[PDB]
Design a protein around this motif. Structure first.
Motif, PDB file in Angstrom:
ATOM      1  N   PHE A 151       0.722  -1.027   0.184  1.00  0.00           N
ATOM      2  CA  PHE A 151       0.455   0.525  -0.049  1.00  0.00           C
ATOM      3  C   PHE A 151       0.892   1.378   0.146  1.00  0.00           C
ATOM      4  O   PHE A 151       1.019   2.124  -1.016  1.00  0.00           O
ATOM      5  CB  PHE A 151      -0.822  -0.018   1.533  1.00  0.00           C
ATOM      6  CG  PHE A 151      -1.458   0.874   2.055  1.00  0.00           C
ATOM      7  CD1 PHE A 151      -2.328   2.157   0.926  1.00  0.00           C
ATOM      8  CD2 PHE A 151      -1.049   1.726   3.205  1.00  0.00           C
ATOM      9  CE1 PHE A 151      -2.280   3.899   1.886  1.00  0.00           C
ATOM     10  CE2 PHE A 151      -1.584   2.892   3.279  1.00  0.00           C
ATOM     11  CZ  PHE A 151      -2.384   3.978   2.558  1.00  0.00           C
ATOM     12  N   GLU A 152       1.940   1.476   1.229  1.00  0.00           N
ATOM     13  CA  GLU A 152       2.756   3.025   0.546  1.00  0.00           C
ATOM     14  C   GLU A 152       3.430   3.141  -0.097  1.00  0.00           C
ATOM     15  O   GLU A 152       3.040   4.597  -0.106  1.00  0.00           O
ATOM     16  CB  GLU A 152       3.406   2.676   2.843  1.00  0.00           C
ATOM     17  CG  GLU A 152       3.915   3.799   2.826  1.00  0.00           C
ATOM     18  CD  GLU A 152       5.312   3.714   2.167  1.00  0.00           C
ATOM     19  OE1 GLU A 152       5.828   5.320   1.926  1.00  0.00           O
ATOM     20  OE2 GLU A 152       5.995   2.795   1.921  1.00  0.00           O
ATOM     21  N   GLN A 153       4.134   1.795  -1.067  1.00  0.00           N
ATOM     22  CA  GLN A 153       4.513   2.558  -1.900  1.00  0.00           C
ATOM     23  C   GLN A 153       4.508   2.925  -3.256  1.00  0.00           C
ATOM     24  O   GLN A 153       5.179   3.215  -4.245  1.00  0.00           O
ATOM     25  CB  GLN A 153       5.701   1.183  -2.296  1.00  0.00           C
ATOM     26  CG  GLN A 153       6.919   0.533  -1.327  1.00  0.00           C
ATOM     27  CD  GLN A 153       8.051  -0.246  -1.242  1.00  0.00           C
ATOM     28  OE1 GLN A 153       7.746  -1.531  -2.028  1.00  0.00           O
ATOM     29  NE2 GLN A 153       9.290  -0.357  -0.727  1.00  0.00           N
ATOM     30  N   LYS A 154       3.117   2.635  -2.907  1.00  0.00           N
ATOM     31  CA  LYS A 154       2.228   3.134  -3.991  1.00  0.00           C
ATOM     32  C   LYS A 154       2.633   2.523  -5.816  1.00  0.00           C
ATOM     33  O   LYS A 154       1.551   3.041  -6.961  1.00  0.00           O
ATOM     34  CB  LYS A 154       2.630   4.514  -4.391  1.00  0.00           C
ATOM     35  CG  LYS A 154       2.489   5.881  -3.392  1.00  0.00           C
ATOM     36  CD  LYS A 154       3.246   6.871  -3.569  1.00  0.00           C
ATOM     37  CE  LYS A 154       2.768   7.948  -2.087  1.00  0.00           C
ATOM     38  NZ  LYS A 154       4.000   7.063  -1.734  1.00  0.00           N
ATOM     39  N   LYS A 155       2.209   1.330  -5.225  1.00  0.00           N
ATOM     40  CA  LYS A 155       3.564   0.414  -7.609  1.00  0.00           C
ATOM     41  C   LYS A 155       1.909  -0.246  -7.470  1.00  0.00           C
ATOM     42  O   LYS A 155       1.696  -0.777  -8.525  1.00  0.00           O
ATOM     43  CB  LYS A 155       4.245  -0.573  -7.503  1.00  0.00           C
ATOM     44  CG  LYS A 155       5.557   0.639  -6.795  1.00  0.00           C
ATOM     45  CD  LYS A 155       5.758   1.640  -7.897  1.00  0.00           C
ATOM     46  CE  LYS A 155       5.326   3.544  -6.980  1.00  0.00           C
ATOM     47  NZ  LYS A 155       5.259   4.583  -8.331  1.00  0.00           N
ATOM     48  N   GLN A 156       0.893  -0.663  -6.215  1.00  0.00           N
ATOM     49  CA  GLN A 156      -0.295  -1.941  -6.886  1.00  0.00           C
ATOM     50  C   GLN A 156      -1.463  -0.771  -7.240  1.00  0.00           C
ATOM     51  O   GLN A 156      -2.527  -1.723  -7.828  1.00  0.00           O
ATOM     52  CB  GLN A 156      -0.629  -2.162  -5.809  1.00  0.00           C
ATOM     53  CG  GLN A 156       0.528  -2.242  -4.824  1.00  0.00           C
ATOM     54  CD  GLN A 156       1.077  -4.003  -5.799  1.00  0.00           C
ATOM     55  OE1 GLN A 156       0.918  -4.673  -6.447  1.00  0.00           O
ATOM     56  NE2 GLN A 156       2.750  -3.362  -5.897  1.00  0.00           N
ATOM     57  N   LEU A 157      -1.481   0.476  -6.750  1.00  0.00           N
ATOM     58  CA  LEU A 157      -2.620   1.242  -7.604  1.00  0.00           C
ATOM     59  C   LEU A 157      -1.667   2.671  -8.488  1.00  0.00           C
ATOM     60  O   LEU A 157      -0.980   3.419  -8.662  1.00  0.00           O
ATOM     61  CB  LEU A 157      -4.068   1.942  -6.499  1.00  0.00           C
ATOM     62  CG  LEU A 157      -4.092   0.637  -5.805  1.00  0.00           C
ATOM     63  CD1 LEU A 157      -4.721   1.246  -4.585  1.00  0.00           C
ATOM     64  CD2 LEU A 157      -4.920  -0.229  -6.428  1.00  0.00           C
ATOM     65  N   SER A 158      -2.945   3.176  -9.447  1.00  0.00           N
ATOM     66  CA  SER A 158      -3.430   4.755 -10.029  1.00  0.00           C
ATOM     67  C   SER A 158      -2.914   5.612  -9.281  1.00  0.00           C
ATOM     68  O   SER A 158      -3.330   5.078  -7.811  1.00  0.00           O
ATOM     69  CB  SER A 158      -4.579   5.077 -10.957  1.00  0.00           C
ATOM     70  OG  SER A 158      -5.646   4.942  -9.798  1.00  0.00           O
ATOM     71  N   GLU A 159      -2.538   6.654  -8.999  1.00  0.00           N
ATOM     72  CA  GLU A 159      -2.129   8.204  -8.449  1.00  0.00           C
ATOM     73  C   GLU A 159      -3.189   8.404  -7.686  1.00  0.00           C
ATOM     74  O   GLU A 159      -3.299   8.537  -7.023  1.00  0.00           O
ATOM     75  CB  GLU A 159      -1.388   9.179  -8.927  1.00  0.00           C
ATOM     76  CG  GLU A 159      -0.505   8.550  -9.577  1.00  0.00           C
ATOM     77  CD  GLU A 159       0.827   9.234 -10.171  1.00  0.00           C
ATOM     78  OE1 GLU A 159       0.562  10.645 -10.274  1.00  0.00           O
ATOM     79  OE2 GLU A 159       2.447   9.599 -10.338  1.00  0.00           O
TER      80      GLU A 159
END
Ligand SMILES: *C(=O)N1C[C@H](NOS(=O)(=O)O)CC[C@H]1C(N)=O
Length: 279
Positions: free
Chosen positions: A174-182
């Motif tokens: 979640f924290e690293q921002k890579k699993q979802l669009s901005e």
């Protein structure tokens, strides 16, 4: 400087002799590996898995299967009855539709059980979310039940479980921002920061105003025991870097005030460990 000896020892004095099984994951921004306590226990997640659920709902939004302004039918008599739901007290009327976006905010920020179970319908049930958790490369966790099944049987909660390693990995993904669009990432962070749940847990002994993106979970009591008192989240340090902390207090005979103090004290120790590395 990762997990080091007085951090593991502070955690040692916080749990020793407490009539509970305490799961701990601490992943500071300079650690190659999380510090874990009770890494081999299966901790019932309760409301914490609404984070996992939201990540799957927003990944299906990112893939187009759903839309944030897509409407969903909420029928007061049809939905899960006699349960925690700020949505079913905020909105009047025998039937109404709310957008998926408001279902997400209700489930994540307000820990809403009806909104959560409706999002389970739209994604393909617990089995959809179980597959998604595995698809992130997280192995030691399982989701087989929804909120309605957990309300029907108090022993079913133990099968929606996570390990402490698996708790760290989802918080990291979640924290690293890579699993979802901005756009999807930014909504989930907002919902996790803006909750007012569990103020005495991860946030309980941090300075006022510390930014903490977190998801709480709590079972009911039975025979003077609480199966789960949980909180899992990302603490923003004063330099802007993330400190991941998850604490799961399982099958506790302590008071609620002690269970939350345990969570709070671990988060404080991890926090202060990181604060001395700077100014
Ligand atoms: C989540 O575990 N639940 C939903 C609701 N919110 O409590 S929370 O802040 O601990 O998440 C009440 C308890 C619990 C439930 N019975 O579903």
């Amino acid at each position: 400087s990762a997990q080091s000896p007085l951090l593991k020892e502070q955690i040692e004095t916080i749990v020793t002799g407490k009539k509970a099984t305490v799961g701990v994951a601490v992943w500071g921004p300079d650690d190659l590996e999380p510090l874990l306590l009770n890494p081999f226990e299966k901790f019932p997640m309760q409301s914490v898995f609404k984070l996992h659920l939201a990540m799957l709902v927003l990944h299906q939004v990112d893939q187009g299967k759903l839309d944030l302004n897509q409407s969903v039918t909420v029928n007061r008599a049809a939905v899960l009855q006699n349960t925690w739901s700020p949505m079913m007290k905020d909105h009047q009327g025998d039937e109404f539709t709310v957008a998926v976006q408001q279902l997400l905010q209700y489930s994540v920020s307000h820990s809403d059980n009806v909104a959560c179970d409706l999002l389970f319908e739209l994604v393909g049930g617990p089995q959809a979310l179980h597959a998604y958790i595995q698809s992130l490369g997280v192995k030691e966790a399982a989701v087989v039940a929804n909120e309605a099944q957990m309300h029907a049987d108090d022993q079913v909660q133990y099968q929606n479980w996570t390990s402490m390693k698996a708790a760290a990995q989802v918080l990291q993904k979640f924290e690293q921002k890579k699993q979802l669009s901005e756009t999807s990432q930014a909504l989930l962070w907002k919902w996790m920061v803006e909750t007012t749940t569990g103020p005495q847990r991860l946030k309980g002994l941090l300075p006022a105003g510390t930014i903490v993106a977190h998801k709480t979970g709590t079972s009911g009591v039975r025979a003077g025991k609480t199966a789960a008192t949980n909180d899992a989240g990302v603490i923003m340090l004063p330099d802007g870097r993330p400190l991941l902390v998850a604490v799961f207090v399982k099958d506790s005979a302590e008071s609620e005030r002690t269970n939350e103090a345990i969570i709070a004290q671990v988060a404080q120790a991890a926090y202060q460990f990181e604060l001395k590395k700077l100014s």
